[PDB]
Ligand binder design. Structure first.
Ligand SMILES: CC(=O)N1CCc2c(c(Nc3ccc(-c4cnn(C)c4)cc3F)nn2[C@H]2CCOC2)C1
Length: 126
């Protein structure tokens, strides 16, 4: 099989903005999540060709990864923090549904999700 095209990171039809909340999320990604011990499976779109994962894109129809999220944040793709939070939720859920409960990679995703949720709790005023 082949890889699908990656998710879009810009779109001329979608309103764009830079906000304090979105800049906070970008900081969290660059300073903490990207550099995390468990970031490695989540930094780029899953390369099903390189990893020879024939089932991945049969199962995952809404792929999402931190490389895409980071690029969206850098490109002001989002209108609000909730849109970005939704992409993280998609990323974590994808891991949970492709893999099996208790798998090492699932425990990694759970740890990163826990940390992300702590960071969301500290999302600034505006
Ligand atoms: C997020 C998710 O659910 N995935 C589905 C399962 C999966 C994923 C990766 N990812 C991955 C693997 C290796 C490397 C790597 C090794 N060396 N270098 C330079 C890079 C990078 C990766 F991102 N492995 N696996 C499986 C394959 C065997 O056991 C885990 C993604």
């Amino acid at each position: 099989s082949t890889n699908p095209p990656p998710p879009e990171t810009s779109n001329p039809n979608k309103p764009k903005r830079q906000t304090n909340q979105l800049q906070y999320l970008l900081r969290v990604v660059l300073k903490t999540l990207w550099k995390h011990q468990f970031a490695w499976p989540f930094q780029q779109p899953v390369d099903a060709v390189k990893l020879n994962l024939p089932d991945y894109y049969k199962i995952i129809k809404t792929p999402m990864d931190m490389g895409t999220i980071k690029k969206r944040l850098e490109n002001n793709y989002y209108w609000n923090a909730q849109e970005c939070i939704q992409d993280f939720n998609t990323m974590f859920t994808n891991c949970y549904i492709y893999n099996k409960p208790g798998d090492d990679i699932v425990l990694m995703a759970e740890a990163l999700e826990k940390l992300f949720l702590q960071k969301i709790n500290e999302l600034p005023t505006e």
